[PDB]
Write a structure and sequence with these properties.
Layout: E1 23-25, E2 33-38, H1 48-58, E3 69-73, E4 78-83, H2 90-96, H3 103-122, E5 135-138, E6 142-145, H4 152-155, H5 168-171, H6 181-197, H7 208-217, H8 233-242, H9 253-264
Antiparallel strand pairs: 1-2, 2-4, 3-4, 5-6
The structure holds ligand T1Q.
PDB class: transferase/transferase inhibitor
Keywords: Kinase, Transferase-Transferase Inhibitor complex
Assembly: monomeric
Length: 267
């Protein structure tokens, strides 16, 4: 029943992801897999029970648009194992290899993202770091959303290249819990902006703290006049709706889904 994967089963391979909170390897285990090992040297049993609780969050998820959690591992290191996605992430596609998606496709990606997000919310999961980086185009047609689970193992364990997707109320760390359904909607808004402009927001300000400061005071927002010539007027409008500075004015995904599923059947 439980998803622990005993020592010696998994075969870690080439190295792909970097940084602190976990190093990511393309393993093998009943086929190709991705393995994310939290390089927290060796822990301290009341961390181990917090790592388990986060796996209770993951297994909550079963949807074609959400990355598939296949099972975790504690033995050699702490690590989570998910399916492997052949093909690159939206961020890579959009900003690195400058892929040219057809508009029909861009909308669909936007749609799947929202679909998956809609699901994540119904299950009471707030992603908290949605961005083009954490959206994977598997086989290049199916969107898999990843990197949404663990959170609790970060705020209690010992936010930069992800400020462009931070809603204002998140940028200005105002209180205890700035993160919300709505904050995600805004993050989804920027990836809407990414899909539709092929650009990251504020590509013309080289000081990053001002970006932080301004977006936090509502002096700065995505320039919605860059939605490429053929982007539907309803999109450029739904975009602005997702990017509302006051979070209470933002739509929730079941409704964001409807606005996309409709502007699709009209093109
Ligand atoms: C169920 C949620 C579990 S999570 O802990 O929230 N997320 C989570 C956990 C473990 C992983 F291995 C991954 C993960 C899977 C993955 C699959 N395919 C690719 N292809 C290449 C990508 C090019 O950038 N990259 C991946 N990267 C970069 C990952 O980080 C993950 F996203």
């Amino acid at each position: 029943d439980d998803w622990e994967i005993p020592d010696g089963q998994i075969t870690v391979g080439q190295r792909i992801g970097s940084g602190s909170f976990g190093t990511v390897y393309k393993g093998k285990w009943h086929g190709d897999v991705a393995v994310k090992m939290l390089n927290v040297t060796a822990p301290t049993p009341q961390q181990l029970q917090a790592f388990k609780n986060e796996v209770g969050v993951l297994r909550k998820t079963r949807h074609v648009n959400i990355l598939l959690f296949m099972g975790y591992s504690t033995k050699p290191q702490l690590a989570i194992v998910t399916q492997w996605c052949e093909g690159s992430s939206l961020y890579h596609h959009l900003h690195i290899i400058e892929t040219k998606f057809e508009m029909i496709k861009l909308i669909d990606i936007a749609r799947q993202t929202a679909q998956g997000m809609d699901y994540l919310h119904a299950k009471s999961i707030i992603h908290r770091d949605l961005k083009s980086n954490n959206i994977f185009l598997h086989e290049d047609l199916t969107v898999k959303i990843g990197d949404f689970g663990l959170a609790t193992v970060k705020s209690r364990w010992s936010l930069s290249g992800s400020i462009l997707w931070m809603a204002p109320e998140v940028i200005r760390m105002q209180d205890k819990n700035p993160y919300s359904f709505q904050s995600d909607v805004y993050a989804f808004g920027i990836v809407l902006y990414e899909l539709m402009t092929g650009q990251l927001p504020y590509s013309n300000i080289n000081n990053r703290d001002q970006i932080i400061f301004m977006v936090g005071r509502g002096y700065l927002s995505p320039d919605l006049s860059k939605v490429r010539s053929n982007c539907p007027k309803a999109m450029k409008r739904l975009m602005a709706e997702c990017l509302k500075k006051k979070r209470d004015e933002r739509p929730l995904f079941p409704q964001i889904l409807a606005s996309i599923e409709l502007l699709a059947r009209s093109l």
